[PDB]
A paper describes a structure:
BRCT-Ab1p_short without the GFGE residues (YSRpSPTF) complex was then crystalized and solved at 2.5 Å resolution. The side chain of F409 in Abraxas inserts into the BRCT hydrophobic pocket created by L1701, F1704, N1774, M1775, and L1839. As F409 is the terminal residue for Abraxas, an extra salt bridge is present between the main chain carboxyl group of F409 with the BRCT domain residue R1699. A notable difference between BRCT-Ab2p and BRCT-Ab1p_short structure is the conformation of the Y403S404R405 region. Although a similar dimer interface was observed for BRCT-Ab1p_short structure, the cross interaction between the negative surface patch (formed by the phosphate group of pS404 and the side chain of E402) and BRCT K1671 is completely lacking. BRCT-Ab1p is shown to exist predominantly as a 1:1 complex with a small portion forming a 2:2 dimer. Indeed, the BRCT-Ab1p peak shifts left to the BRCT-Ab2p peak position once the concentration is increased, indicating the tendency of BRCT-Ab1p to form higher order complexes at high protein concentrations as observed in the crystal structure. It is likely that at high concentrations, the BRCT-Ab1p complex is packed in a conformation that is not stable at low protein concentrations without a contribution from phosphorylated S404.
BRCA1, a large protein of 1,863 amino acids, contains an N-terminal RING domain and two C-terminal tandem BRCT domains. Abraxas mediates the interaction of BRCA1 to other components of the BRCA1-A complex, which include BRCC36, NBA1/MERIT40, BRE, and Rap80.
Residue numbers in the entry:
A (entry chain A): 1646 to 1859
B (entry chain B): 403 to 409
């Protein structure tokens, strides 16, 4: 069948979005507020060097191997009144993981070798600023298998379980340290997932590990 | 607005 251009925007003011809306309207490009499997283009606010902030749409964009391109793609296409090529405007990095890590490009090219493949991940709440099912969708897009309960982890030397938590979300008790007594798997911060996705390369769990009381 | 959070 025909999968058609379909955009979402991120990090744009309500104003800048209007320009995109006009752009989408002129060229009859589908524009939506919510990102989906169908979405092909994620238009990010960036600087002159195509570096951008890390938003939910940014992560999901890369994870889905979609076109993650700069807002300049839209404005420049307007200034030339033509549909410019995405390749020229693909974001090269973000503020956090490097300004040219080429995460988006690698994500487009590694859809047969997903980073989280062969892993089972449980997103152990609570979290903030990012719905748990969105985080779960993010890993799922990256080949990881999602697990709801710590007791739902699949056993076997061939399956690797990972528990992901956000320490800042917990309150005044090192509860997150007590998880290890519930099941044996590595407990890592949400940053591990976010860094891995942004670069679209599976980071070593070392720097993200959380001390589990015996 | 209620602009999207950043990580």
């Amino acid at each position: 069948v025909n999968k058609r251009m379909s955009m979402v925007v991120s990090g744009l003011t309500p104003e800048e979005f209007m320009l995109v809306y006009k752009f989408a309207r002129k060229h009859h490009i589908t524009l939506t507020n919510l990102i989906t499997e169908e979405t092909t283009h994620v238009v990010m606010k960036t600087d002159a060097e195509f570096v951008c902030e890390r938003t939910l749409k940014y992560f999901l964009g890369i994870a889905g191997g979609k076109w993650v391109v700069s807002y300049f793609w839209v404005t420049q296409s307007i200034k030339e009144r033509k549909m410019l090529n995405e390749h020229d405007f693909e974001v090269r990095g973000d503020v956090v993981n490097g300004r040219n890590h080429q995460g988006p490009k690698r994500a487009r090219e590694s859809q047969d070798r997903k980073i989280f493949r062969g892993l089972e991940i449980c997103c152990y709440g609570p979290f903030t600023n990012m719905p748990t099912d969105q985080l779960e969708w993010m890993v799922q897009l990256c080949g990881a298998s999602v697990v709801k309960e710590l007791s739902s982890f699949t056993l076997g030397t061939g399956v690797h379980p990972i528990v992901v938590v956000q320490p800042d979300a917990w309150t005044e008790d090192n509860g997150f340290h007590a998880i290890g007594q519930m099941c044996e798997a590595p407990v890592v911060t949400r940053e591990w997932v976010l860094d891995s996705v942004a670069l679209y390369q599976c980071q070593e769990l070392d720097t993200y590990l959380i001390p589990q009381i015996p | 607005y209620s602009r999207s959070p950043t990580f």
